[PDB]
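Long-time lurker, first post.

We've been arguing in lab meeting about whether S-adenosyl-L-homocysteine would sit comfortably in this protein at all. Half the group thinks yes, half thinks no, and nobody has a model to point at. So I'm putting the question to the forum: if I give you the sequence and the SMILES, can you give me back a predicted structure of the complex? Inputs are below. Any interpretation is welcome too.
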Amino acid sequence: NKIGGRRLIVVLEGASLETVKVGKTYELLNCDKHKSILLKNGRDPGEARPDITHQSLLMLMDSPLNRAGLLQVYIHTQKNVLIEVNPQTRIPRTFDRFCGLMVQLLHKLSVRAADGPQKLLKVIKNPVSDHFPVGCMKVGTSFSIPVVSDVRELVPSSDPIVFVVGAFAHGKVSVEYTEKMVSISNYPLSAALTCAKLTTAFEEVWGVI
Amino acid sequence: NKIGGRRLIVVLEGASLETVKVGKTYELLNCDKHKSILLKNGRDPGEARPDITHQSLLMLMDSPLNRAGLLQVYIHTQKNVLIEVNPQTRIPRTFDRFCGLMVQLLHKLSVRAADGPQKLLKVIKNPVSDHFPVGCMKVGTSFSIPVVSDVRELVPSSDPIVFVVGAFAHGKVSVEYTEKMVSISNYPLSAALTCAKLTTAFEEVWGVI
Ligand SMILES: Nc1ncnc2c1ncn2[C@@H]1O[C@H](CSCC[C@H](N)C(=O)O)[C@@H](O)[C@H]1O
Ligand SMILES: Nc1ncnc2c1ncn2[C@@H]1O[C@H](CSCC[C@H](N)C(=O)O)[C@@H](O)[C@H]1O
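Top reply:
Settle the argument with this. Predicted structure of the protein with S-adenosyl-L-homocysteine, as C-alpha cells:
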C-alpha cells in the first residue's frame, strides 16, 4: 500500500468565529461592526477577524489537493468550538454570506446540504487530536521558528499528516498535540497564503497536477 | 548582470470593478446588491464579481515575491480602465473597505498614501503592453490549454516576464500581446489560487525564501 492513508489534515487554530446579539438579530462578531460591545471573559472584540478564516477556507477548499480527495479541514475557534468541514463544502466567496453560514452553524450545530441529507459543516467533540487517524505526524506552523523548512521535504510519501495554521488576528500556534513547529518562510505570511503554499507543496509531492 | 531586470508582472485581466449610482450614493457594482439595475452596453450586473479581484490582490500583495521587490501588478477592468498598483499598497482585508477604495480610485483616478505624496493606485493609459519593460515574454493562463505546464520551468533566470490571469466571473484570457497560453493545472482554479501558485513558483526559482 504505497498510497496508504495519505492525506493532509489542516487545523485552522484560534479561528475568530463567534456570534453576538445586537438588538433582536444575531451576527457574526466582526471588529468593524462590534468594537463598542462587551464580551464575556474580558475578550477583545477589536481582535475579531473572521475574514482570516473565510480567506483561508477559500484557498483550502479550491485546492487541487481537496478536489483530488487528499485534504481534510477542521476549524478550532477561540471559544473552543471544533468544526469539521466536509470536503464537498463550497465556501461562499462573499464574506457576508460566509458570516451568515457560520451563524447558522454555531446555532444549529450543523449545516446540511439543501439537496441531500449530508452534513457539510458540523460541530464535533474536542479534542481535535481524537479525530486524527493512526500513524499521523502533527506539525505546527510559526514565523518565529529560526530555521525555515522546505515544505516538500515535510511531505510523507504514504502517511497522513496534520498541519496547524493560526487563524487568529494575532498570536502563535500553541497546542498540546504537535510534535514539532516549522517556519516555511523568512516573511510573516497570511494564514490564507500559508494554506495555498501547504496545499501546493503536497500536490507536487503526491502527484496532483 | 545575473539579476538583470528580472521580475514578475501580473495583469489581472477583465477585472469586475466599476461604479454605479444608487440614489445619491456611488457604490462598487456587485451582483448581490445590483442585479435589478441596468447597465450601459447591455452588460450584465449579475456577472459583477469584484471579490475575485479583491482576493487575487490579497495573494499577490502578501507574497514574499512582492515584499522582495520582484512583483508588479496591473488591473485591466472590463470597462477598459487600466490601473497600476504600487508594490507598497496594502490591500484591505475587508471586502467593503476594498470596494470603497476602488470607488475612490475610479472617481479621482488615483489614491495617495495618507502619510506621503506617493500615489499607491493610479489609472494609467492603455494599452498595458506599452508599460512592460524591454526583453519581456508575455504569457496568458487558461484551464482550456490541453497540456499542463510546470510553472517553475516557465521562470526565466534573468528576464522580466508577464503573466495574464483572468479576474472575470466567467471568460477566457484573450489579449493581443501574449506570445503563448499555458495551463498550470488539470483543475479549474480560482484567480486567487492561480496568483498564489505563480508567485510561489517564481519565489522558488529566484531564491526568495
Ligand atoms: N513564515 C511562516 N512560517 C510558518 N507559518 C507561518 C508563517 N507566516 C505565517 N504563518 C502561519 O500563518 C499564521 C499567520 S498569523 C494569524 C493569521 C494572520 N493574522 C492573518 O491575517 O492571516 C500563523 O499563525 C502561522 O500558522
Ligand atoms: N488550470 C488553469 N491553468 C491556467 N490558468 C488557470 C487555471 N485555472 C484557472 N486559471 C486562471 O484563473 C482564472 C479563473 S477564471 C476567472 C476567475 C474565476 N471566475 C474566479 O472566481 O476566481 C482564469 O481566467 C485563468 O487566468
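For your lab meeting: Residues A 52, 141-143, 165-166, 168-169, 173, 183-185, 187-192, 194 surround S-adenosyl-L-homocysteine (ligand 1) (CB under 6 Å). Chain B touches chain A at residues 32, 49, 51-52, 55, 58-59, 62-64, 67, 93-97, 148, 185-187, 189-190, 192-193, 196-197, 200, 209 (CB under 8 Å). Whichever side wins, do check it experimentally.
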